[PDB]
């Protein structure tokens, strides 16, 4: 039969049985629904780092904030697993960003805008 | 639940697996000699297997006869060449381009390669067994056609 | 290296060869399309009358191009100049009408 | 949290409390190492992520 | 394969179509075209997370992949996984040759 | 891993989008910009002990 | 991101004022990702802290503050109090205290005279319980990095650079006296700490209305102005993509003196007419083009008299000195043609001075060749609301 | 180029410049149809009665101050943004440098003179069609890290070789000043004599500029000028001793 | 910990507190022994002693 899509593409007689039982009298000693409560989270894949990447247009597309997730989880204002207060000086630390394009220039003015300015820097019109 | 981003690997199709259809362009009609076939009293009109008009030519559609369970939404569809199709070339790296009825002298290779990628990409299907039928027409006898 | 000159007193319009002395507008030539695309607006204003009535068979080079068709009845009279002029005006230094 | 959910043992500082609530210091002394390590460990906390 | 078609690449490729014109492809152009390929693949198979997304960063005129580390005394250990068969790739090449 | 082993320690972890045979602009990907072997991660010693 | 601003700024009323267009940024597109920060209490904290330190080291501390990074204080009472605070309601006691001191302070008894409690209270330390504890006198450079590290920093001292003082206990025990983040924010007192930060330049430093902000900007421009990031209003606009009396927006013009005396343009000298208010410019309609300021009778055209009359005087661009023009048509120099060539700053000032605090008569002394007759004729011709604000009748 | 009858070239420090911080040092020189005598009655002609006069004995001093002003204005460093490839076939697909500002329409035409088409037989066209095609825009870059700023580029653009040489000398001066964070760590460590430790990273760097290092002789010159300054007062040195106390 | 120089840190932490009672020889006249255990991160700057 038909299967719907998930995304948006480009168009858009027999007698008494002798030996079955339903006595249920066994406890799951680790705690089975609790293990799957952890295991669904284990199944959850990570997100993406889509910065430093253009779009179909062509123009390109966390120490304070990564700690806040753990501070929300632990029900504590402080945090034990931290990405700051680290003795390792990573003062070099390239993090990708929309500051730089794929070439090596900047992005104060977007790529498609300056391509349009370039190709409009020579135009021609009809005379009178 | 299955949380992971599972792709759609196996996909089935019940229609034709062709990807070229034959349009007529300018219609025509002639004085026909023999009109229909008479069995005893019933008349069966002659049906040509494709058009019969004045000028006919092949255009390119991807899955024009398909009963797919699950499309991939990647079909290339070009119109008959009385009108253009140059939006197909416009759509890809003409990233600013004025005069909508134009396409770049420099983007032809990228356009054609992306069209061929779409064209191979909207054919990744399988072929359903779809059941048969027997005929006893005197023009093909005993052949078990595909329904 | 294509450069157009014309002079006073019935002097025919000249155009710069790849190699030699400037030539008039009465020959079979070869253009790559970028030469027309330099400024289409200047070029067609220079060339179109000689295209229409003069003997000037130009050969634009592409290699590849999309195309459309227009049928007609050959029992009667036909002309292309509106269509060809629409194409030669719609051409621009970014894109090509088919 | 998956390893925390599956692992058979359990962590408690009640071993610390049972061990260290024994020892004490005489009432004339300014410092005690037992109370010192209790203050440094803070065994009242239960956080083991 | 497709970026080696549209630009220069050391990669040994069969090079079926040439008469179609192109340009000297730069970093931004290659990045756009590779993203069109990426989103075409992704929407065609209805992935929602990703594929090739940081590979769509920097200059994508590329070759086979390799990851490596180095010790203290200058010794570098690389690994280069050899390439298996190329189903969609040589299907593209087959229909291009057609 | 190494026990007490100097020159056998790994320092940088790099990844290349370029074939070995032909030189080009040095790519030198983003993981190499970490000072240590990779992205650091601070851990509280108290909970460990 | 982060960007400086050369004024006091609040989360509350600065959105009502619209400071970015007030300083001249074309931010008419409602991009609304600029969360205005509350930087009014920092001035009060500052002026409280000038009584125990030099200005210089306090500014040198205050420059390092990551205003994007969030932190807070908690005031602590002195040492001779905190035991008596923990005595009543012993529930709120941290676990960093002591096993022996908790056993001493858990029970009910008044414990006023017992050598156990006396040797423990003498043995008590305030900084081993609470780890930051900035200090009484802390050499306040370090407290900025202390507030940068932790989300909360503990103190016993009132005087602080930082976000909010909070009280650990009720007030009766004492001596005498979270946030939403958008992608951009403005705020005075910038920081060099942030890799990404910017400083709104363009404004004169001589014309800053507040003086604490003026002192701060003088120090920050006199040290490590190399590593700062001075950006124009156009850069700010490109990064983007109850109404008050006596706070007018005010600008500064860029004209010069030329002539056409021999059928030719000829540039002689260049001038600056400071702090002319933009309302008079936009209501007189002044543009870049060539003007004639003195009509052919010998008297001014009087709109230019008004233009220099509401503003103050002239700075020559080559000497940076005073300049007071000739009002006569004698040939040492005159001014026939001018051409205003742009504006330079867009700050806002208070209009009402400090001294005028009661309704009482006003006297003004002038030099002898002041334009008394013409200014009386100009105030004679004032009509705004069907009312004459300065009639001739009582001048 | 301006399609006029007579075109002369005139002198303007930074008419194509989105500067960071002005020197307030611009040299304006109006075209020779009109007057420029104020630049030459600038310094020592405080006694010329008419507005249009200048003592010829002050000419050399005025010209020296003007040349000093000229070189003292443009003491900046060239910063780069915005490379993109055109889609016009005017070049060989050469990458063109962008620049910020209100517009960029006239800027590419004035910047890359051999880009334009060659229709006529004008003097402009006869000049331009005799040029070389490949020497347009980008031709070299220094890419250290993946997905980051190209560190320094080389472009073919319209310029002034005088001010290019001046900027080159100033760049060489600053490069002589430049130092390494490892040796800042070394210097501050041994200056603190081990009581304070500091930490410098050990990784590939993007590029830096710390202009802090000078020679010994310049320190000696500055110290001599300073001690010559504080002569025979003791009220200039009393607060120094108070500060150290 | 996955830190390779963790035993170097383990040596230096005792070394920092035994600054001034018991001394150890250095490699050059630029690093006083009293530098902290934090900065020892690289495979280099491991002491000869």
DSSP G246-265: SEEEEEEE--EEEE-TTSS-
Cβ atoms within 10 Å of G287's Cβ, excluding its own: 8
Nearest-CA residue of chain A relative to H90?
A: A122
Report the C-alpha gap between I34 and H197 in whole angstroms.
8
Report the C-alpha gap between G167 and A82 in whole angstroms.
28
- Asked if I14 and H174 touch (Cβ cutoff 8 Å), the reply is no
Report the C-alpha gap between G344 and G317 in whole angstroms.
13
Interchain CB distance below 8 Å, D28 and G119: yes
Put residue A114 in one of left, alpha, beta given phi > 0 → left and psi -120 to 50 → alpha. alpha
Report the C-alpha gap between G310 and G303 in whole angstroms.
11
Instruction: Output the six-digit token pair for E93.
Output: 């090449």
Report the C-alpha gap between G372 and G365 in whole angstroms.
11
Please state at what angle helix G55-62 crosses helix G41-49, rounded to 10 degrees: 140
Nearest-CA residue of chain C relative to E22?
A: C64
Burial of G220 (0-12, 13-18, 19+ CB in 10 A): buried
Put residue H147 in one of left, alpha, beta given phi > 0 → left and psi -120 to 50 → alpha. left
- Spatial CA neighbour of G195 closest among G316, G367, G69: G69
Instruction: Output the six-digit token pair for G246.
Output: 């006596």
> Nearest by CB to A64, which of G69, G149, G152?
G69
Instruction: Output the six-digit token pair for G197.
Output: 């930060």
Task: Give Cα separations from A88 to F36, F41, G248 (angstroms).
Answer: 7, 9, 51
Q: What angle do CA G336, G342, G344 make, to 5 degrees?
A: 125
Report the C-alpha gap between A67 and G69 in whole angstroms.
12
Helix (H, G, I), strand (E, B) or coil at G373: helix
b/e map H71-95, b = 16+ CB within 10 Å: bebbebeeebbbbbbbbbbbbebbb
Place of tokens 């040439």: E18
Q: How many CB pairs under 8 A join A and D?
A: 21
Mutate to test the interface with C, among E17, E21, E96 (most CBs of C within 10 A): E21
- Spatial CA neighbour of B114 closest among E2, E88, E42: E2
Breaks in chain B (C to N > 2.5 A) come right after: none
Report the C-alpha gap between G48 and D4 in whole angstroms.
51
With the C-alpha atoms ordered G281, G286, G292, G295, is the resulting torsion angle positive or negative? Answer: negative
Interchain CB distance below 8 Å, H204 and F29: no
Between positions 166 and 195 of H, the ones with CB within 8 A of I are: 186, 189-190, 193-195
Question: How far is it between the farthest Cα atoms of chain I?
Answer: 32
Interchain CB distance below 8 Å, H120 and C2: no
Q: How do strand H83-85 and strand G290-292 relate by DSSP bridges?
A: unpaired
Report the C-alpha gap between B143 and B136 in whole angstroms.
8
Report the C-alpha gap between H24 and G318 in whole angstroms.
9
Instruction: Output the six-digit token pair for F25.
Output: 């602009």
Report the C-alpha gap between A113 and G261 in whole angstroms.
47
G118 CB-near residues (< 8 Å, 6+ apart): none
Report the C-alpha gap between H39 and H29 in whole angstroms.
8
Question: Does the CB of F45 have a partner CB in chain A at under 8 Å?
Answer: no
Instruction: Output the six-digit token pair for H222.
Output: 């500055």
Instruction: Output the six-digit token pair for H62.
Output: 């005025």
Cβ atoms within 10 Å of H168's Cβ, excluding its own: 12
A88 CB-near residues (< 8 Å, 6+ apart): F35, F36, F40, I41
Instruction: Output the six-digit token pair for H2.
Output: 């301006």
Helix (H, G, I), strand (E, B) or coil at B31: coil
- Asked if E28 and H147 touch (Cβ cutoff 8 Å), the reply is no
Place of tokens 């198979």: E45
Question: How far is it between the farthest Cα atoms of chain A?
Answer: 103
Instruction: Output the six-digit token pair for F30.
Output: 């983003």
- Asked if B146 and B128 touch (Cβ cutoff 8 Å), the reply is no
Nearest-CA residue of chain A relative to I5?
A: A88
> Nearest by CB to F19, which of E10, E59, E67?
E10
> Nearest by CB to I46, which of F6, F11, F35?
F6
Question: Does the CB of H38 have a partner CB in chain G at under 8 Å?
Answer: yes
Place of tokens 């002034």: H160
Instruction: Output the six-digit token pair for G166.
Output: 């909070």
- Asked if G143 and G150 touch (Cβ cutoff 8 Å), the reply is no
Report the C-alpha gap between G163 and G178 in whole angstroms.
12
Nearest-CA residue of chain I relative to H196?
A: I35
H helices within D1-49, ranges in order? 2-6, 14-20, 33-41
CA–CA min distance B92, chain H (Å)? 13
Interchain CB distance below 8 Å, F16 and E68: yes
- Asked if B8 and B70 touch (Cβ cutoff 8 Å), the reply is yes
Q: How do strand B144-146 and strand B132-134 relate by DSSP bridges?
A: antiparallel
E69 secondary structure, DSSP code: E
Report the C-alpha gap between H24 and G270 in whole angstroms.
13
Task: Give Cα separations from G224 to G217, H63, H179 (angstroms).
Answer: 12, 34, 17
CA–CA min distance A123, chain C (Å)? 8
Interchain CB distance below 8 Å, I42 and F4: no
G148 CB-near residues (< 8 Å, 6+ apart): G64, G65, G66, G69, G71, G193
Place of tokens 């005010």: G250
Interchain CB distance below 8 Å, H34 and G266: yes
Burial of E79 (0-12, 13-18, 19+ CB in 10 A): exposed
Stated as kind and residue range, the H or E segment containing A116 is helix A111-120
Helix (H, G, I), strand (E, B) or coil at G221: helix
Does B contact I via 3+ CB–CB distances below 8 Å? no
B78 CB-near residues (< 8 Å, 6+ apart): B59, B60, B61, B85, B88
Q: Which residues of H touch G198 (CB under 8 A)?
A: none
- Asked if E60 and E31 touch (Cβ cutoff 8 Å), the reply is yes
- Which chains have 3+ CB pairs within 8 A of A? B, C, D, E, F, G, H, I
What phi and psi values does residue H138 have, to the nearest 5 degrees? -65, 140
What phi and psi values does residue G99 have, to the nearest 5 degrees? -65, -45
Report the C-alpha gap between G180 and G196 in whole angstroms.
19
CA–CA min distance H151, chain A (Å)? 8
Mutate to test the interface with A, among B95, B98, B106, B118 (most CBs of A within 10 A): B95
Question: Does the CB of H88 have a partner CB in chain E at under 8 Å?
Answer: no
I32 secondary structure, DSSP code: -
Stated as kind and residue range, the H or E segment containing G271 is strand G266-277
Stated as kind and residue range, the H or E segment containing B26 is strand B21-26
Task: Give Cα separations from A92 to A87, A88, A89, E29 (angstroms).
Answer: 14, 11, 8, 29
Report the C-alpha gap between H153 and H139 in whole angstroms.
8
With the C-alpha atoms ordered G18, G19, G21, G25, is the resulting torsion angle positive or negative? Answer: negative
Instruction: Output the six-digit token pair for B70.
Output: 């699950």
Report the C-alpha gap between G284 and G300 in whole angstroms.
16
Q: What angle do CA H75, H79, H84 make, to 5 degrees?
A: 150
Burial of B3 (0-12, 13-18, 19+ CB in 10 A): exposed
Task: Give Cα separations from E87 to B67, B123, G81, G211, H37 (angstroms).
Answer: 25, 13, 79, 73, 79
H helices within chain A, ranges in order? 32-43, 63-73, 111-120
Task: Give Cα separations from G152 to G74, G144, G163 (angstroms).
Answer: 7, 12, 10
G303 CB-near residues (< 8 Å, 6+ apart): G284
Q: How do strand H137-141 and strand G322-323 relate by DSSP bridges?
A: unpaired
The rounded radius of gyration (Å) of the Cα atoms in chain H is: 26
Mutate to test the interface with I, among H199, H200, H201, H203 (most CBs of I within 10 A): H199
Show the beta-strand stretches assigned E in chain I: none
- Asked if D5 and A38 touch (Cβ cutoff 8 Å), the reply is yes
- Asked if G97 and G83 touch (Cβ cutoff 8 Å), the reply is no
Helix (H, G, I), strand (E, B) or coil at G382: coil
Q: Which residues pair with H97 in a beta bridge?
A: H83
Q: Which residues of G touch A64 (CB under 8 A)?
A: 68-70
Interchain CB distance below 8 Å, E63 and F19: yes
What phi and psi values does residue G154 have, to the nearest 5 degrees? -100, 145
G273 CB-near residues (< 8 Å, 6+ apart): G252, G253, G255, G307, G308, G311, G312, G313, G314
- Which chains have 3+ CB pairs within 8 A of G? A, D, H
- Asked if G351 and G250 touch (Cβ cutoff 8 Å), the reply is no
């Amino acid at each position: 039969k038909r299967i719907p899509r998930k995304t948006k593409g480009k168009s858009s007689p027999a007698t008494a049985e002798p030996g079955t039982s339903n006595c249920e009298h066994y406890k799951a000693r680790p705690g089975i629904a609790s293990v799957q409560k952890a295991t669904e989270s284990a199944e959850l894949p990570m997100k993406n780092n889509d910065e430093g990447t253009p779009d179909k247009r062509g123009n390109t597309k966390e120490a304070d904030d990564a700690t806040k997730k753990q501070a929300k989880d632990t029900e504590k204002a402080k945090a034990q697993v931290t990405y700051s207060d680290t003795g390792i000086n990573n003062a070099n630390e390239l993090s990708r960003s929309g500051n730089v394009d794929n070439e090596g220039g900047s992005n104060q003015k977007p790529m498609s805008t300056r391509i349009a300015e370039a190709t409009s820097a020579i135009v021609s019109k009809h005379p009178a | 639940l299955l949380h992971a981003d599972t792709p759609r690997l196996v996909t089935w199709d019940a229609g034709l697996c062709t990807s070229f259809k034959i349009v007529p362009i300018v219609p025509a009609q002639v004085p026909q000699d023999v009109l229909a076939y008479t069995f005893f009293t019933s008349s069966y009109a002659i049906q040509s297997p494709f058009p019969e008009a004045a000028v006919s030519r092949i255009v390119v559609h991807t899955r024009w006869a398909s009963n797919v369970d699950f499309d991939r939404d990647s079909s290339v569809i070009m119109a008959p060449p009385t009108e253009n199709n140059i939006h197909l070339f416009k759509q890809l790296l003409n990233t600013e381009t004025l005069s909508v009825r134009g396409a770049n002298p420099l983007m032809f290779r990228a356009n054609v390669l992306h069209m061929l990628l779409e064209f191979v990409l909207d054919n990744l299907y399988l072929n359903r067994h779809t059941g048969f039928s027997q005929d006893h027409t005197p023009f093909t006898e005993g052949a078990n056609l595909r329904s | 290296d294509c450069r157009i000159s014309f002079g006073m007193n019935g002097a025919a319009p000249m155009i710069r060869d790849e190699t030699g002395m400037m030539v008039p507008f009465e020959g079979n030539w070869i253009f790559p399309l970028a030469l027309w695309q330099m400024n289409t607006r200047y070029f067609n204003q220079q060339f179109d009358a000689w295209i229409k009535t003069g003997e000037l068979r130009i050969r634009i080079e592409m290699g590849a191009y999309p195309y459309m068709l227009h049928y007609y009845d050959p029992r009667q009279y036909a002309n292309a100049w509106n269509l060809t002029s629409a194409w030669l005006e719609e051409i621009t230094p970014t894109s090509i009408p088919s | 949290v998956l390893l925390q959910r599956i692992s058979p043992l359990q962590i408690d500082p009640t071993i610390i409390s049972n061990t260290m609530s024994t020892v004490s210091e005489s009432t004339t002394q300014t410092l005690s190492p037992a109370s010192s390590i209790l203050g440094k460990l803070r065994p009242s906390n239960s956080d083991f992520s | 394969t497709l970026v080696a078609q549209i630009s220069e690449t050391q990669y040994p490729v069969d090079r079926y179509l040439d008469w179609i014109p192109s340009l000297r492809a730069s970093a931004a152009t290659a990045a756009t075209f590779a993203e069109w390929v990426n989103t075409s693949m992704k929407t065609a198979f209805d992935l929602s997370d990703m594929l090739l997304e940081p590979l769509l960063s920097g200059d994508p005129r590329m070759t086979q992949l390799a990851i490596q580390y180095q010790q203290y005394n200058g010794r570098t250990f690389n690994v280069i996984p050899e390439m298996p068969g190329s189903v969609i790739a040589d299907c593209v090449q087959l229909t291009a040759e057609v | 891993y190494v026990r007490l082993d100097r020159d056998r320690v790994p320092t940088m972890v790099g990844v290349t989008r370029q074939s070995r045979d032909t030189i080009t602009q040095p790519a030198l990907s983003l993981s190499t910009t970490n000072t240590t072997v990779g992205v650091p991660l601070a851990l509280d010693a108290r909970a460990i002990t | 991101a982060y960007i400086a601003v050369p004024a006091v700024v609040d989360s509350r009323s600065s959105e009502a004022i619209g400071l970015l267009e007030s300083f001249g940024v074309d931010a008419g597109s409602d991009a609304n990702d600029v969360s205005y920060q509350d930087h009014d209490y920092v001035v009060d904290q500052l002026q409280y802290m000038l009584d125990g330190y030099e200005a210089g080291d306090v500014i040198d501390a205050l420059v390092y503050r990551n205003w994007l990074h969030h932190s807070v204080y908690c005031l602590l009472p002195p040492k001779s109090q905190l035991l008596e605070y923990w005595k009543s309601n012993p529930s709120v006691i941290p676990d960093n205290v002591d096993r022996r001191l908790r056993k001493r302070l858990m029970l009910k008894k008044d414990l006023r005279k017992d050598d156990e409690y006396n040797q423990l209270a003498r043995a008590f330390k305030i900084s081993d319980v609470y780890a930051p504890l900035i200090s009484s006198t802390t050499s306040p450079m370090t407290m900025i990095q202390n507030l940068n590290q932790g989300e909360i920093v503990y103190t016993t001292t009132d005087r602080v650079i930082g976000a909010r003082v909070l009280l650990y206990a009720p007030r009766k025990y004492y001596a005498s006296t979270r946030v939403p983040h958008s992608r951009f924010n403005v705020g005075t007192f910038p920081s060099i700490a942030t890799p990404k930060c910017s400083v709104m330049s363009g404004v004169d430093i001589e014309s800053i209305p507040n003086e604490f902000i003026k002192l701060f900007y003088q120090r920050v421009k006199s040290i490590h102005a190399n590593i700062l990031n001075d950006i124009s209003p156009q850069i700010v606009s490109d990064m983007i993509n109850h109404v008050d009396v006596y706070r007018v927006d005010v600008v500064n013009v860029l004209f010069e003196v030329v002539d056409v005396a021999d059928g030719l343009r000829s540039v002689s000298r260049k001038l600056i007419m400071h702090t002319v208010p933009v309302c008079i410019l936009e209501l007189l309609g002044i543009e870049i083009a060539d003007y004639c300021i003195r009509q052919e009778d010998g008297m001014f055209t009087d709109w230019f008299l008004l233009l220099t009359m509401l503003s103050d005087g002239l700075t020559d661009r080559r000497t940076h000195c005073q300049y007071l023009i000739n009002p006569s048509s004698m040939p040492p120099d005159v001014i026939l043609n001018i051409s205003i060539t742009g504006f330079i700053n867009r700050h806002t000032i208070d209009v009402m001075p400090d001294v005028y605090d009661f309704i009482k008569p006003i006297g003004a002394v002038l030099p002898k060749g002041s334009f008394k007759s013409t200014i009386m004729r100009v105030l004679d011709s004032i009509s705004v609301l069907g009312v004459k604000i300065m009639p001739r009748a009582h001048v | 180029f301006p399609e006029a009858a007579v075109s002369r070239i005139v002198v303007h420090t930074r008419w194509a410049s989105n500067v960071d911080f002005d020197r307030d040092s611009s040299v304006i020189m109006a075209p020779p149809t009109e007057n420029n005598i104020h630049l030459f009655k600038q310094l020592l002609n405080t006694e010329t009665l008419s507005v249009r006069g200048a003592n010829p004995l002050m000419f050399r001093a005025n010209v020296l101050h003007m040349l000093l002003e000229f070189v003292l204005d443009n003491l900046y460093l060239n910063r780069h943004t915005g490379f993109s490839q055109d889609h016009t076939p005017f070049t060989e697909g050469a990458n063109l440098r962008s620049l910020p500002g209100p517009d960029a329409e006239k800027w590419y035409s004035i910047m890359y003179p051999t880009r334009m088409g060659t229709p006529n037989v004008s003097k402009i066209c006869n000049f331009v069609a005799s040029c070389v095609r490949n020497r347009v825009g980008r031709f070299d870059r220094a890419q250290m890290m993946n997905g980051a700023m190209s560190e320094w580029v080389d472009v073919f653009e319209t310029s002034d070789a005088l001010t290019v040489s001046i900027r080159g000398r100033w760049m060489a001066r600053l490069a002589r000043m430049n130092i390494n964070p490892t040796e800042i760590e070394w210097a501050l460590t041994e200056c603190a004599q081990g009581y304070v430790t500091v930490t410098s990273p050990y990784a590939p760097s993007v590029n830096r500029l710390m202009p802090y290092r000078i020679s010994n002789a310049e320190r000696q010159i500055s110290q001599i000028i300073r001690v010559m300054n504080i002569g025979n007062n003791a009220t200039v040195i009393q607060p120094v001793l108070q500060d150290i106390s | 910990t996955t830190d390779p120089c963790a035993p170097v840190k383990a040596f230096m932490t005792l070394a920092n507190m035994m600054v001034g009672f018991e001394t150890i020889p250095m490699d050059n006249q630029i690093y006083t022994q009293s530098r902290r255990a934090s900065a020892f991160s690289t495979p280099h700057t491991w002491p000869r002693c």
